[PDB]
Structures are given as structure tokens and as C-alpha cells.
Symmetry: C2
Subunit: 279 residues, 2 copies
């Protein structure tokens, strides 16, 4: 509407973006998203399972799609010419990026302050955070490249190879699904790849599911994911969401995605939700 | 005004059978879990963050949040069987009993009885005995059996009485600044029951004990709904005499008349009139 390459934004656009987020934060609306996100990771389908309402199963993409939309709509309610932009990490793949500049996301974590980010719009003291329980946490943390599993960001080819996969998702609709676009993008096939890998590479809150959205980068990242998925939906036009049925409740096409009543089907056609990327 | 909520002791065996069945259905379908989860997610959402007030307790939204919660539940009951409604457990009358555990709410055909001391107070009678009914912990993780321990703690040796109810109905204000546990002369704070507590709502939870004894795991017990119905009923009666809400403004965001009550967009205002949500209580 359009969701643009974060690398293509003007210095006004970058600034207005940050501005808005921080307003969403002042009003108390931003915490709803953090918590909602936390709620869903705790909602396992069925209880005891690996899968939750937002990750490690089919609902992953529609959930985060519905997550971003609500979010964008809220930015719109503050400043209508703002759209959720996206961080094309595949061509970033790693900190020599403009995204981490002082004016935008801020930089990596301070190893001397326990990796609390001490620069950028959301450094500690300028930006409060909440832990997995929903109590004050002490600040945004980040640790680029720290773990052996995710020393680098996914490359272009990784992205192109995922887009070749013929089916949206396959039984048993979890992190072991094979030839599954969903599982490849999320990044569980020879993980961490793609989505899981970006998460492990950033570190800090972004490094753990129920705290990830404390980092505004979450939205630039999840926007890039959503984009890859929309692209895949443009490729495989003969293919649709799965499962349609006989998935765990919350994962099927016409199930409500906890914490909402929104279902995958409601979000299956992103243009319908009223926005596009840089084609 | 068409849905009617009846006093539990007034349900025939057949209505009790049906309500139990509808519940087990919400359970197997995986719908009932959304309720336990939402309830837990709310308690961990502080307004403001760090505050002792959460989106559903320890503050003004307590009654509205719980009525909205019941209304969504009943509606899910309704999508299975549109003749079923939320009953209420009039605990202040069972109080009167020499021994409330013998209250017919606890019979094997409805809620089930008291925990078994030898089996660590896991309930082993009724529709929701250990094995027939599963539970989750406050973290969204697998738990064990349903447990009950009627009137165990010294804090709540007894079920709140008629006079307790009657006396809370005398309260003139809905709630008072600073909109919390310390709010004085507040119907909301009174009914919730922590202040000058345990009484009423809090006391009931403590009286039952087991999962009901702790807030974030309480919806694991079906009676959670029967008791909060009685709570809705009582606030309904209050509202019959008093017929609305504070804080209207100014309060912590999520507590005011027109604020959304996490995890939803529903406001306290949306639920101020119960009749006009589609239900009345038998005694209406
Ligand atoms: Cu996520
Ligand atoms: Cu993520
Ligand atoms: Cu409660």
C-alpha cells in the first residue's frame, strides 16, 4: 500500500516510522502486541505439543500476517502515510547495514552492559521492556552472530530455493514437515535457516520467541517474511493453504488463531487486506 | 433477553447432563483451552506494566472482563447447543449447609465432589475426574489432575454468606481511585474480595482450593464458570439497584470505560448491559 524496501526509504520516512512506533509505545498499544505474541507462544496445539498458535505449525505465516496487519493499521491511526517496511536480510546476508544506524534501529548490544543496546531510538532508558512473564526486563538486548548455529544471515539463494517448494505445508503440520514451504521459511528444515536463523543471528530478545517483539526489528523482519510468502503465493497459484482439515485445532484453514478469532482464510490474500510490496 | 441462566440447584438431571456434555465438547474440540489461556494471558498483562493491577484483576475491569469472558464462553456453548446456558452456583446458600460439600452441585452427575486426601486431593468423582479431564499450568504447559480441597486453608474456612452478599449490595460506588486493591467503599473491590479479605470472590476460590485456589490456573476447574456466573449474577443484581462504571477517564490505560480489555478490543462499556447481550438470570 505500499510496503517498501527499508533500504529505499527516505530519511523522513525512516524518522516518521520510528516516531510512530514510539507513539504506539507511549499509548500502551505496543505492549498489547508483545503480550499477544507471548500469549500465542504459550498456546500449544494441542497442549503439550511443540506447536503453538503462532509458530512451529501451519498457522505460522497467517498468524504473523494478521499480526502485522493489525500493527500497520495502528501505525496508520497515528500517521496514515506510514507503512510497515521490510528488511531484505537476504541481500544483507552482515551488520554493515544501514538498518542499524543511530537514526533507525540502533546497533548491536553492549557486551560490557550485558548486551543491552545503548544506541539508537530504542536503547535502554529510552525504551522499556517486558520479560516472558510480562514484568519489566531491563532493556533491549542484541548479540549479532554470537551462536555457532547462526553466525550469518540467510542468503538470496536460500530464499529462492525455498520459493521452489511445491506445497504450502505437509503433515504432520509441525517442525518436521517435509517439502513444506512453511517449514522451510520458518526455518526448521536443517535449522536454523531463514526465519529461525535471522532470529538466532540478531540475539537478545529477538533470540527468544516470547520476547522477540520487544525489538522493533521484529516487524521489519516479519514484513520481509510475509513478503517472501506473498511472493510464493504469486508463484504457486495452483496451491492453497494447508491443512484444510485434520490439523490440530488452530492450524486448519477455518480455525480461529488464538489469541484472535481471525483465521488463516481471512488473511490468505494479502492484497485483499489492502497493501502490496514493491512488486 | 432470551437466554436464561438458572440456579444450579434448580437444573434437572437432564439439563445438568447437557451442560456437562457441551463443556466436554468445547474441551475436546480445543476451544475450552482458549479460555484458560486468555485468562492467564490477561493476569500477566499489567496496566501499567509493572503495576499490581492486571487487565482482569486487582482493578476496575475485573467484573467487565469476566462478564465478557463468560459471554464468549456461553456463545461457544451455544454454537454446539443453542439451548444450553451458563448456570450459576449460589454459594452463599450452600454456606448455610451444615456441610457444603454435600451440596448437590458436587454430585457425580455435575461438578464432581471434593478431592481425595489420599490421592493428593485430585478429584476422582464426576464428569471431570482425573483421567476424564486434563489440565495445564500457569505457563501453558501440561499439568496433572483436577484437585479440590473444600475449606482447607485457615483463610477461607467457610463459604461467603448471604449477609456478605447483602452487605456488598449496599455499596454505592462501582469503584474508587486509585482503582486498585486499596480502593475503599468500592463495590468492585468489595466483590473481588482481596481487601478486607478473603471474602466473596477471592474467598470462594480459596475455599475450593486446588486449581481454583490460584487465579491463573483456576479456569482449569469447570466450577470456575459456575462461580463467576454467580459473580456476574451478583453484579447484575447490583446493577439492578444501582444499575455503571469508573474509571470513566484518567485511569490506567485498559481500565477506563472506553479502553480495550486485553486480550480483546472489547471495552467495559460494551458489557455494561447484560440483558442486551442476550441473557438474564433465572431470578430476573
Ligand atoms: Cu513470532
Ligand atoms: Cu519471529
Ligand atoms: Cu479471574
Amino acid at each position: 500500500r505500499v510496503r517498501k524496501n527499508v533500504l529505499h526509504l527516505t530519511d523522513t520516512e525512516k524518522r516518521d516510522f520510528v516516531r510512530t512506533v514510539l507513539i504506539l509505545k507511549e499509548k500502551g498499544i505496543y505492549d498489547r502486541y508483545i503480550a499477544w505474541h507471548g500469549a500465542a507462544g504459550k498456546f500449544h496445539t494441542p497442549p503439550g505439543s511443540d506447536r503453538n498458535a503462532a509458530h512451529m505449525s501451519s498457522a505460522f505465516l497467517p498468524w504473523h500476517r494478521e499480526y502485522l496487519l493489525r500493527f500497520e493499521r495502528d501505525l496508520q491511526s497515528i500517521n496514515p502515510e506510514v507503512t510497515l517496511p521490510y528488511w531484505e536480510w537476504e541481500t544483507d546476508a552482515p551488520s554493515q547495514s544501514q538498518i542499524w544506524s543511530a537514526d533507525f534501529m540502533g546497533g548491536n548490544g553492549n557486551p560490557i552492559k550485558d548486551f543491552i543496546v545503548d544506541t539508537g531510538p530504542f536503547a535502554a532508558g529510552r525504551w522499556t521492556t517486558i520479560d516472558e512473564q510480562g514484568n519489566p526486563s531491563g532493556g533491549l538486548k542484541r548479540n549479532f552472530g554470537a551462536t555457532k548455529e547462526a553466525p550469518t544471515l540467510p542468503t538470496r539463494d536460500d530464499v529462492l530455493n525455498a520459493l521452489k517448494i511445491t506445497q504450502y505445508d505437509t503433515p504432520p503440520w509441525d517442525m518436521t514437515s517435509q517439502n513444506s514451504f512453511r517449514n522451510q521459511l520458518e526455518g526448521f528444515i536443517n535449522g536454523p535457516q531463514l526465519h529461525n536463523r535471522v532470529h538466532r543471528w540478531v540475539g537478545g530478545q529477538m533470540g527468544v520467541v516470547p520476547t522477540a517483539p520487544n525489538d522493533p526489528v521484529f516487524f521489519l523482519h516479519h514484513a520481509n517474511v510475509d513478503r517472501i510468502w506473498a511472493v510464493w503465493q504469486i508463484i504457486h497459484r495452483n496451491q492453497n493453504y494447508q491443512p484444510m482439515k485434520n490439523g490440530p485445532f488452530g492450524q486448519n484453514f477455518r480455525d480461529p488463531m488464538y489469541p484472535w478469532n481471525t483465521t488463516p482464510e481471512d488473511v490468505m490474500n494479502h492484497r485483499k487486506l489492502g497493501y502490496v510490496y514493491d512488486i
